[PDB]
Subunit: 205 residues, 5 copies
């Protein structure tokens, strides 16, 4: 309690907040998805609503501390507003992302920050053939809105999406779910742009 | 009036806010449900809307005071933003929780805090067989999003859900309603994961 | 202008805000309703949407002043956020209350505060028989969420609801509208729980 | 840039904010409407949605300055939260007013403030006969919620509503649109109550 | 990291925020659109929902710095709340604009600021003839709500709208998309009013 109050004061009130990664000091943001349910499928507007967990993970030198100095505290929990968070957003989103969980991140002594917010995302997806046996395949690209490849480097611990937490009595069943890291190049800009393409193949139950 | 103004000033303006429970200093959060109505049942998207009271109860040493010192004041009411609140959220939620009551908590001299917000929750539930006599059973797990068993220990005063405040002229009648405390242990991590499973068996009137 | 600026400064900037009524210093909150329209009636979910004026009235010793001292000012208007307001909310509400008017209260020299916000409330009501000649009767209890009878004492100036401001070309006509003060007791505790029961009998036009 | 920063600092940071008009110091608020479109017409709930511009105009002695003293600056733009705004709201509104434009006001050297927010208003209107050639007439009264005639005096520069900005390919065409200043007198209270009655006669295209 | 923290501190914490452009010091705001999808088309209310990128670009002398002085930093990213942003809004909007991306702007050493927020806009558009081969043409004017031509001068780098990022499996295909700069003078006011007219010709797939 007392040691934890001193730790948060020496990390946020003492040192100024992280201004973001630069080309000289890049940051590696490892992200993984945990698909919960395909709630709505709109064939009239070509919109699909997803319920998932966006496991965001990054390591900062500014959020590093010795546990021995702060009463053997290895890790702590703090609000997402108190710390810097990556701007990883869906490029093909149709409606603003609805946060279903409290925005709280876990910070460890080595500076590794883990933030897993539960989100409801309505994105661009044509569901023509969802009632079919082969189903319909729909992709949605996730990545940094302003930072490029030289600033934020996206990573995936596994190519497979976590479907263990998926709703058993869902209206739509998953046939395939993959999170592939893609390195894109744009004519405008010489810098590369990394994006995690969430490809989901689903059909009606 | 005058003694109450001094009490709130000596508790919030003097001492810094609670940073959250740690492994060394755990917290026991006792929660109970009071089901009011099953407003909406969506068979098209497998979503069910519930109106209930989430009776959150926890004891803090920081919010302790002697009533004799503060003009025999045994308890007081303060905004939920002024004090620390547990991150108890539904794991199978589809849409953000709608708060129907003012977020105000009751703090007693022994440090016990009681916060009962009225909420509207839309969660994952297959209502196939709601028109049947046996009805349909739907569960929703409630627990801390970031804190584990070593930090927040969930508790239930009773295994039965309060149905005395349930709407008599509701579209759906309750056959069974139970709030069971579940302790999950995984091969990954040695920490326990406590969640209150709200199981409700209901049918059409 | 100049005398009014000094009055508001000597009342809010000088003295700290009202912490709420205690058992030793109780408060009498007189409330009355002015029904405007029954906008929506949902037979599918048993929800009824009401448009009304909640005339909240209470007297505080802290908001008392001599008009002769402040340039013969008898009363003034201030934002509902600047002053303390009672937590009077509908116990059978289904969706959060939508405020249709600016939240501004009128404070008189004797300390009497009048706050009349226009609200849209969607509450639990079975409308089976609204198309009938006798119509359907639906009640909704209004009261303090955290304070009991020893802290907040509810009062009604009249048992009849103001229907003079009711919409003439409404889809539903009012047959009866009453605001009854009800006292609820529990064996445990000696504190009474006062609530204003808004009973409305209506039918289709 | 530099002269404008000094001007805003000498007007808001120096002098305290306007507490509102009193009986001794009344304020004249001139308002005009610019109807854009009749988006929705609900015959089931007797609700009509309007898209319009509410041109609010008032003169304050506190917001007066000499342009010669502040580098020949005749007028400036500031947020609606930084200055005092009148509580002009629709008395027959069914849903909260949706603001479609940024809430920014234009303040001139003579103290005249102009605030024109684009709004979407859902109000009480029976549309029985909208498909007819003569159409349907629907009125909505606009006025101060707390201030009476002795505090806020409403004014209209013209009795005709601006229909030059009205959508040509709208589902409903305007036959007549008038903004009439009405003074209401009650035997109860000697104070008058001024309201701008927006009368619109429309039919299907 | 260290040089970037000093740069943001010397730009925002040192100098006060931009008060907005004046007649003496005008600002040129270059804006371009990147149409993603025509999600909804409502023939009942004459409303059309668009998903697009509003590329806002302006140069400020206050946000200028020498990269050699701040460790060869050419550009940085900061929140849209930390800096001044133009009040560019759609004049024919029916519902408030939904922001789908994080509001973060890119600031370069020469003072050029680029802010590209992804937005969902529901505006006035008659879709009679969308099922036809020639399709339906719908325009929406974009511009500063309070600042005139003498304060904010709108510009377009190209007359053609970026359709490279448009959804291939959309319900509606684009036949033509143009962003035309229009300078209109009104009888009311002596100042010119510049607006970017987004004209889109589309049909069903
Ligand atoms: N298409 C998604 C993303 O692409 C990366 C990118 C960024 C800037 C530019 Cl100038 C070009 C490309 C994006 C993000 C923000 C705006 C436009 C596009
Ligand atoms: N499903 C909701 C919750 O489950 C508890 C839980 C946590 C971690 C692990 Cl490894 C297993 C289970 C949750 C909270 C945070 C992250 C992911 C999930
Ligand atoms: N039934 C609605 C409301 O009643 C007031 C009341 C408060 C406390 C107690 Cl111990 C009993 C009743 C309410 C509000 C909050 C919690 C439980 C109930
Ligand atoms: N209709 C909105 C407002 O009208 C002004 C008005 C004030 C007093 C009276 Cl007695 C009548 C009308 C209002 C505000 C409070 C109560 C009732 C109405
Ligand atoms: N139609 C869009 C815009 O037109 C420019 C304009 C500005 C002020 C005035 Cl007094 C007249 C016209 C606008 C912006 C604000 C209010 C009304 C209209
Ligand atoms: Br940080
Ligand atoms: Br606390
Ligand atoms: Br008060
Ligand atoms: Br002001
Ligand atoms: Br700025």
């Amino acid at each position: 309690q007392a040691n934890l109050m001193r730790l948060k004061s020496d990390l946020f009130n003492r040192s100024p907040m992280y201004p973001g990664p630069t080309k000289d000091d890049p940051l590696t943001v490892t992200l993984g998805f945990t698909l919960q349910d395909i709630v709505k499928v709109d064939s009239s507007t070509n919109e699909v609503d997803l319920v998932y967990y966006e496991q965001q993970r990054w390591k900062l030198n500014s959020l590093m501390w010795d546990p021995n100095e702060y009463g053997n505290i290895t890790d702590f929990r703090t609000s997402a507003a108190d710390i810097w968070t990556p701007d990883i957003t869906a490029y093909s989103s149709t409606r603003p992302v609805q946060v279903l969980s409290p925005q709280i991140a876990v910070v460890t002594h080595d500076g590794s920050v883990m933030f897993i917010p539960a989100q409801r995302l309505s994105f661009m997806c044509d569901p023509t053939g969802v009632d079919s046996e082969e189903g319909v395949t729909c992709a949605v690209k996730f990545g940094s809105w302003v930072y490029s490849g030289f600033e934020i480097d996206l990573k995936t611990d596994t190519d497979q999406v976590d479907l263990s937490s998926y709703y058993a009595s869902s209206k739509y069943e998953i046939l395939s779910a993959t999170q592939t890291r893609q390195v894109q190049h744009y004519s405008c800009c010489p810098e590369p742009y990394i994006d995690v393409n969430l490809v989901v193949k689903f059909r009606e139950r």
